[PDB]
């Protein structure tokens, strides 16, 4: 079999658990003058160089003495061992994957391959972890006239491939990721297999480790307090000393975790980074070898006609490597800190909270036992304890190391907002799970409808409930509130005949309480409410209320994005990225915020009430405006268009049409004419003082049809740039929207007619999304043909000359317009242009 030589120092150094002291598990005797011990190896060197108590003042006695006559001594024995250790393994990890990217000194004519097995088999096949396209282009032989162009291109392709740095999309909440690391090294659990980014979303930094180490996390020992019977002054000192000692145990535990992190986990990540540096160098080297071999196949005539600089090729590739290494280093360093903060430190905090509990119990009992010898003051010392063991010691890495590189990567980690996510509920395999990395337990009961668009429905059923049990070892809100909640929601319209109960009956939707303190989200009709309840029962709320007398509401039964932030001074609600409300909460004392979270409708609700929700997240900091707006934009992104409610737009689904520039207008086939007239929406016609809306389920029933199954279907979702037919139902027939080919003016009425093939009419529409901000609107473009560059016009509404000469009568029609074609290129995109359309399907959350 193939044998690969590996230097000892390219192996992974991983300290064994036996390296670490379990002295923290020892008991401690606490007394009136017990001190807390801390060793600082960080030494002021100038204190030594100046110290004049250091160098001896005493004279050296004479070296002369009696002969040695006792020669007993142990003498070390040294022995060589073999310079080569042969081991047998059929595994392929970093060592094997790197070797597959090399070629021997007697080979020049190499080709790149994406097959690791081929690369090992054939000495002219070199493995590459870059894309199939890169590989194909590098293997390409061209004629001398094209060669210089092919060099430029493939060298630039190398720099682009090396610099790759994003996932499928930012909805995954991954800060940075270099997607080819798996393919480059196959470290960890076969990370060259499957999709690396996806596996990383599920499992995080752990997937890259070669070995998950067993951590030493000792049960901290009992404190044994000394009695000083009839000495108040020294009993108080003993309590104080036990409290100072408790801090030392926290500190020593964190130091113990840091030592293990550095010598079992961060060492593995270092080996990965070095591996990547070599891998990229191997790729560059192979490319250069390829470029040389191909250059030298050409004749001297050809060679003098080609201008290429080989040092320039080399420095451009090296420059690519340097930028790629920066990304890799930041990514891997983040992985290493992530493992420390999510997978190590919390298990320590768990043992230390248990110890704090036991110590608190002990210290109160000792204050009881000494109540007589501490008359009156006993209750004051009991509250000294309770208080002092309240604030949980923060982990600061810079206490345990002054390594600049480590401190800087820790700082970067803590300044990245996605690392503040402490709960991130996401759909996976017909369930919801926490993808934050802290492993909250999430129980979804049978009455919660889930779907793969990450939407979930809460109903009035008793079993329509989600329980989240939060990780108790996460520290957030140290001293003052500093957290945020974000989610999307869809709240159905009031029933017109149930308007009084809608207006008056508050119902909880999400409740997070422990010991009668915590937070909740509730709804009362058209108001969504965030409530804080502190340990003393003081209550503060902030709310967003949308107007239910709008002709057309942006919020009613439509998906919108909520973000709640809390800091020292204020609770704020943002809607769709914009601040809506603010409540001064300076009077709020402690709020217990890590009780179980129950998603469930609770209150005096109609049997038919429901709420949809999506992308529930909790952050352990106050998000800024700009963080929130970005999150809004990121979570709005899709390849698919959307309907009026915010759900994906579909083929073969009945839709009424809404115009964003003419909100109260709708399309009706004009009587005995094949054109679409524009009429005014009817409205709520009863007399509740609470209510006004315009009717939505009116005008022609449209339906979008796919132009061709020419490409892969597999679903009925409408995507941007798709070619469609826009059809509608006229009585029991299906008709179609056309544009007459001879289109002389700036605007022209659309032709609404039976399905029929005429050389005089265009029938093909490209559905567009010109807006760069989140929107449910789309645009409808007529082009000459699918492959044509030439644009005919956009579908819209315009006013056409109808009749009269002294007073001209004008009338609105459904039209095609050339004017919109220029308007849509203007920036920022005009949301309210009459070429912006939305499709309204019947929906159980809108009745009229």
């Amino acid at each position: 079999g193939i044998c690969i030589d590996v230097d000892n120092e390219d192996l992974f150094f991983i300290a064994d658990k036996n390296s670490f002291s379990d002295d923290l598990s020892k008991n401690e005797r606490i007394e009136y003058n017990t001190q807390s011990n801390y060793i600082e190896n960080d030494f002021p060197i100038n204190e030594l160089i100046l110290d004049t108590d250091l160098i001896s003042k005493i004279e050296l006695p004479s070296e002369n003495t009696e002969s040695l006559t006792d020669f007993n001594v142990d003498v070390p024995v040294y022995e060589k061992q073999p310079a080569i250790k042969k081991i047998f393994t059929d595994e392929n990890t970093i060592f094997q994957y790197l070797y597959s990217q090399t070629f021997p000194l007697d080979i020049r004519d190499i080709s790149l391959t994406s097959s690791f097995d081929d690369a090992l088999l054939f000495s002219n096949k070199v493995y590459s972890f870059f894309s199939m396209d890169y590989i194909k282009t590098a293997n390409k032989v061209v004629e001398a006239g094209l060669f210089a162009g092919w060099v430029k291109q493939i060298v630039n392709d190398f720099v682009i491939e090396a610099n790759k740095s994003n996932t499928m999309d930012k909805i995954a909440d991954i800060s940075l990721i270099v997607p080819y690391i798996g393919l480059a090294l196959n470290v960890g659990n076969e990370t060259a297999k499957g999709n690396f980014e996806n596996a990383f979303e599920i499992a995080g930094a752990s997937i890259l480790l070669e070995f998950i180490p067993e951590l030493l996390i000792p049960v901290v020992g009992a404190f044994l307090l000394e009695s000083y019977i009839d000495n108040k002054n020294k009993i108080i000192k003993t309590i104080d000393n036990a409290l100072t000692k408790r801090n030392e145990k926290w500190s020593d535990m964190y130091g113990l975790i840091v030592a293990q992190w550095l010598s079992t986990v961060n060492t593995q990540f270092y080996t990965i980074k070095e591996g990547m540096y070599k891998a990229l160098n191997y790729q560059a080297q192979a490319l250069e070898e390829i470029i040389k071999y191909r250059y030298n196949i050409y004749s001297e005539k050809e060679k003098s006609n080609i201008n290429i600089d080989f040092n320039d090729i080399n420095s451009k590739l090296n420059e690519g490597i340097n930028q790629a290494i920066d990304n890799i280093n930041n990514f891997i360093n983040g992985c290493s800190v992530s493992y420390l903060m999510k997978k190590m430190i919390p298990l320590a905090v768990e043992k230390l909270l248990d110890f704090d509990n036991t110590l608190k119990k002990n210290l109160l009992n000792y204050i009881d036992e000494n109540k007589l010898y501490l008359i009156g003051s006993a209750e004051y010392e009991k509250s000294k304890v309770n208080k002092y063991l309240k604030t949980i010691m923060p982990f600061d890495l810079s206490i345990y190391t002054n390594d600049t590189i480590l401190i800087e990567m820790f700082n970067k980690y803590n300044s990245e907002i996605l690392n503040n996510i402490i709960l991130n509920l996401r759909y996976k395999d017909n369930n919801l799970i926490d993808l934050s990395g802290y492993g909250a337990k999430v129980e979804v009961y049978d009455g919660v409808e889930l779907n793969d668009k990450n939407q979930f429905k809460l109903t009035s059923s008793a079993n329509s409930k989600i329980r989240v049990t939060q990780n108790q070892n996460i520290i957030f809100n140290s001293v003052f509130l500093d957290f945020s909640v974000s989610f999307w929601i869809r709240i159905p319209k009031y029933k017109n005949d149930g308007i009084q109960n809608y207006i008056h009956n508050e119902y909880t939707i999400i409740n997070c309480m422990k010991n009668n303190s915590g937070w909740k989200i509730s709804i009362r009709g058209n108001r969504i409410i965030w409530t804080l309840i502190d340990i003393n029962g003081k209550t503060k709320s902030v709310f967003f209320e949308y107007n239910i007398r709008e002709d057309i509401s942006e919020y009613i039964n439509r998906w919108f994005f909520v973000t709640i932030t809390n800091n020292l001074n204020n609770a704020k609600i943002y809607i769709n990225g914009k601040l809506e409300s603010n409540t001064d909460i300076k009077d709020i004392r402690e709020v217990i915020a890590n009780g179980e979270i129950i998603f469930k409708l609770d209150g005096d609700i109609d049997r038919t009430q429901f709420i949809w929700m999506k992308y529930f997240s909790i952050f352990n900091t106050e998000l800024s405006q700009s963080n929130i707006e970005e999150r809004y934009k990121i979570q709005s992104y899709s390849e698919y268009l959307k309907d009026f409610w915010g759900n994906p737009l579909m083929y073969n689904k009945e839709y009424y049409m809404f115009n964003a520039g003419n909100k109260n207008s709708y399309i009706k086939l004009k009587k005995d004419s094949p054109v679409g007239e524009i009429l005014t929406r009817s409205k709520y016609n009863q007399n509740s003082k609470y209510i006004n809306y315009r009717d939505l389920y009116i005008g022609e029933k449209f339906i979008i049809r796919r132009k061709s199954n020419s490409q892969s279907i597999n679903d009925d979702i409408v995507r941007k740039e798709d070619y469609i037919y826009l059809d509608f139902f006229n009585l029991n027939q299906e008709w179609r929207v056309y544009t007459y080919k001879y289109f002389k003016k700036e605007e022209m009425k659309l032709f609404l007619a039976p399905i029929y093939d005429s050389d005089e009419f265009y029938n093909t529409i490209q559905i567009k999304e010109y807006d760069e901000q989140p929107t449910y609107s789309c645009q409808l473009l007529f082009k000459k043909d699918e492959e044509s560059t030439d644009e005919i016009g956009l579908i819209g509404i315009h006013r056409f000359y109808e009749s009269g000469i002294v007073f001209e009568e004008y009338k609105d029609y459904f039209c095609i317009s050339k004017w919109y074609l220029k308007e849509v290129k203007r920036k920022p995109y005009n949301l309210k242009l009459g070429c912006n359309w939305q499709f309204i399907p019947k929906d159980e959350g809108w009745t009229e």
Partner: peptide
């Protein structure tokens, strides 16, 4: 049907030429 379409086309032309 063909015949419908042709009659509708004439109606369209009359609308366009208002």
């Amino acid at each position: 049907q063909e015949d419908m379409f042709a009659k509708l086309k004439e109606k369209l032309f009359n609308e366009i030429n208002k």
